[PDB]
């Protein structure tokens, strides 16, 4: 598949190796950073990713109207909207 | 439930 390189050498001292090697173009002694800020930022970003992964996934709360919306296409040919209203029953036994 | 059915 992918071609290889014959003339690649990452000569490094054992002491240079313990920190990183020239096979990864960034490895080695990195700039010291704040760890708690990184931790909280990763937590918040994972929370935001979970929120959008939920929003873009299948939603059970989709047919209750409002922001969720109404599951239309579920009305039928013999279905009559609640907007409709019949009249009270009047049988001949009820007049005179 | 307690008797009949679970719940």
């Amino acid at each position: 598949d992918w071609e290889t390189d014959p003339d690649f050498v990452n000569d490094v001292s054992e002491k240079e190796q313990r920190w990183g090697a020239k096979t990864v173009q960034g490895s080695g002694h990195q700039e010291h950073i704040n760890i708690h800020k990184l931790r909280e930022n990763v937590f918040q970003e994972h929370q935001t990713l979970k929120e959008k992964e939920l929003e873009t996934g299948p939603k059970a709360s989709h047919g209750y109207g409002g922001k969720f919306g109404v599951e239309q296409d579920r009305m039928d040919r013999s279905a009559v909207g609640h907007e409709y209203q019949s009249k009270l029953s009047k049988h001949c036994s009820q007049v005179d | 439930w307690x008797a009949x059915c679970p719940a």
């Binding site: 939920l54 709360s61 047919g63 409002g66 109404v70 239309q72 009559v80 609640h82 036994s93 | -």
Partner: protein, 372 residues
């Protein structure tokens, strides 16, 4: 200015909102997820139990447990968590400043209402509360005063006939057969194809397959021959890991358990006979109005073909000269909440609350006298 909270808390889905709106503010599955692994990345948001939507987005590594089975709260520590998440995280409002209108199924044990009231008055410290029958709010929302409500939630299916506002409690019928049983029956019939779903986190995938693909056949003994002759009825579904399933015959055999509960090993009659018997329990005079005002509600009645089959059944069952009209609006997935918001906003209702003073005088045993 204080406005009541309408909080449904039925089995399967909890829907909360403010009194006087046209749609629930927050809808989320009523589950509680316990983590079933021991994670050591401490400080990254670890918890002991995830409630509502937060459980679904993590259901892969959780055991999901429903605190309400068949309308009965089998775990009250979990129900307190559900209510706390509803109050402080979904609605974001203190409970001690608004009255709370909860709903319940008919023919539930009295301990359910007793503990509902005790919790709403001793833990959340609400100033007033109420407990309403769901099938009555499902008629409030429909803009009626006479009709038979056929409410089929996730865990329980009950029918209540009302005429001119006077309910007939001697004809209220209940049937412990709903979405949760249809979802556990689909989990069984899916094995005939080779698909094996067993984990509580795959019951949700099966519930999604059921609420996206399944339909109710108008004629079961004919649709069986149809699905047997040709492959023009199959549908494919894509699991959240890549695998694809296909279901042709299960589509209408899943909701057919509603009309033939013998499929699940139950003696009881189907939902059409449950409604018909509940109609014929009333008086001879009001049966005509109950026939032509048959309301539907609840998620389990959101099946394409449910109204046609229900009419075909209750028409072959009713006298030949009675007109049947299955009132089934597309907003019936939340009719009970709309009825609750209508009832809580009325002025003549502001005397029907159970005040904190009343509860302090007679304890939790009061909810039986006030609440119908």
């Amino acid at each position: 200015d204080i406005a009541a909270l309408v909080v449904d808390n039925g089995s399967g889905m909890c829907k909360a909102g403010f009194a006087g709106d046209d749609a629930p503010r927050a809808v989320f599955p009523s589950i509680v997820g316990r983590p079933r692994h021991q994670g050591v990345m401490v400080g990254m948001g670890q918890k002991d139990s995830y409630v509502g939507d937060e459980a679904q987005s993590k259901r892969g590594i959780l055991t999901l447990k429903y605190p309400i089975e068949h309308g009965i709260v089998t775990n009250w520590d979990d129900m307190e968590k559900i209510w706390h998440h509803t109050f402080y995280n979904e609605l974001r409002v203190a409970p001690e400043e608004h009255p709370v209108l909860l709903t319940e199924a008919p023919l539930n044990p009295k301990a359910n209402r007793e503990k509902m009231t005790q919790i709403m008055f001793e833990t959340f410290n609400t100033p007033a509360m109420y407990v309403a029958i769901q099938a009555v709010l499902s008629l409030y929302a429909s803009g009626r005063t006479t009709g038979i409500v056929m409410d089929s939630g996730d865990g329980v299916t009950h029918t209540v006939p009302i005429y001119e506002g006077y309910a007939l409690p001697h004809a209220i019928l209940r049937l412990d057969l709903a979405g949760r049983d249809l979802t556990d029956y689909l989990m069984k019939i899916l094995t005939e194809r080779g698909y094996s779903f067993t984990t509580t986190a795959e019951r949700e995938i099966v519930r999604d397959i059921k609420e996206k693909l399944c339909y109710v056949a108008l004629d079961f003994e004919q649709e069986m021959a149809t699905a047997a002759s040709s492959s023009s009825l199959e549908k494919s579904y894509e699991l959240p890991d890549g695998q694809v399933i296909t279901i042709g015959n299960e589509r209408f055999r899943c909701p057919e358990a509603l009309f033939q509960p013998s499929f699940l090993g139950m003696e009881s009659c189907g939902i059409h006979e449950t409604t018909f018997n509940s109609i014929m329990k009333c008086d001879v005079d009001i049966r005509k109005d109950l026939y032509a005002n048959t309301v539907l509600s609840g998620g389990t009645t959101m099946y394409p073909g449910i109204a046609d089959r229900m009419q075909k059944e209750i028409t072959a069952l009713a006298p030949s000269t009675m007109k049947i009209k299955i009132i089934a609006p597309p907003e019936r997935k939340y009719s009970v909440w709309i009825g609750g918001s209508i009832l809580a906003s009325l002025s003549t209702f502001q005397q029907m609350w159970i005040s904190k003073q009343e509860y302090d005088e007679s304890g939790p045993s009061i909810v039986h006298r006030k609440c119908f």
